[PDB]
Design a protein around this ligand. Structure first.
Ligand SMILES: [Mg+2]
Length: 269
């Protein structure tokens, strides 16, 4: 045959297409939440947000930037015994509401840390949040055998310290046979990770163009959310274990790279 394998799927394995538009609707680009990262760090769109997670995280503005067509976040070694994991966080200045779709092309740092892509508005006691990835391809804990291919996705709906949470994980070994990223670990190549936030409760994740996990919020979302990427570690087996300090001097594994983000609003045609 003269055809290509990708012609046999309605999915775009490159991640460059949103989900099918429902009848009477269309996808339009939100330019303030989209970037190819070819024109530096655009401060009209993005900000370095430096609140810390727990020890050993130290968020720093110099641990993120835009270079060689990518947004990057690098983990380096500090000399405070309790804040030695120097890292960074980039978040949108604009906020977004349903119905919307966002997808980002990411190659993770190969250290024991969550490489993240998430949407949030709020704090520990009151928030609406969608985690598209919390992906760790190099767990140190000897306890996460599927982590190199496991897409960790979930939501949180928190009202006055009452948490509703559910996971909708997916595994990249469950992608379709024609998808060339099937079984490719998170550090080996860039993957695309998306979310169709359909309405106040329905959240559908996407991986390399294919429907991944999904969740239904137990309560309506009511907030508009910022888009965030960060890289963090902690001494917890659910994260995959604490990052090895020796890996932070290796520039081939210590850097999370984001090639692009495409964000779309679904609107009336
Ligand atoms: Mg790029």
């Amino acid at each position: 045959s003269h055809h290509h394998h990708h012609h046999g799927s309605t999915y775009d394995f490159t991640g460059n297409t949103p989900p099918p538009a429902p009848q009477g609707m269309k996808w339009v680009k939100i330019s303030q939440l989209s970037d190819e990262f070819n024109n530096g760090f655009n401060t009209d769109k993005w900000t370095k947000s430096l609140w810390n997670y727990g020890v050993p995280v130290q968020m720093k503005a110099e641990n993120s930037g835009v270079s060689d067509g990518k947004l990057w976040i690098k983990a380096t070694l500090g000399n405070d015994p309790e804040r030695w994991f120097e890292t960074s966080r980039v978040m949108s200045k604009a906020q977004v509401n349903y119905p919307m779709y966002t997808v980002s092309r990411i190659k993770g740092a190969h250290i024991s840390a969550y490489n993240t892509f998430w949407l949030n508005n709020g704090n520990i006691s009151n928030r609406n949040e969608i985690d598209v990835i919390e992906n760790n391809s190099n767990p140190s804990c000897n306890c996460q055998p599927d982590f190199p291919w496991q897409m960790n996705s979930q939501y949180f709906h928190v009202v006055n310290d009452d948490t509703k949470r559910n996971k909708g994980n997916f595994d990249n070994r469950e992608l379709s046979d024609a998808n060339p990223l099937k079984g490719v670990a998170w550090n080996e190549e860039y993957h695309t990770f998306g979310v169709w936030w359909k309405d106040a409760t329905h959240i559908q994740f996407y991986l390399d163009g294919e429907p991944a996990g999904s969740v239904v919020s137990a309560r309506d979302f009511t907030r508009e959310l910022n888009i965030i990427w960060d890289l963090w570690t902690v001494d917890a087996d659910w994260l995959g274990g604490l990052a090895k300090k020796e890996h932070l001097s290796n520039n081939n594994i210590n850097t999370m790279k984001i090639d692009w983000i495409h964000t779309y609003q679904l609107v009336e045609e």
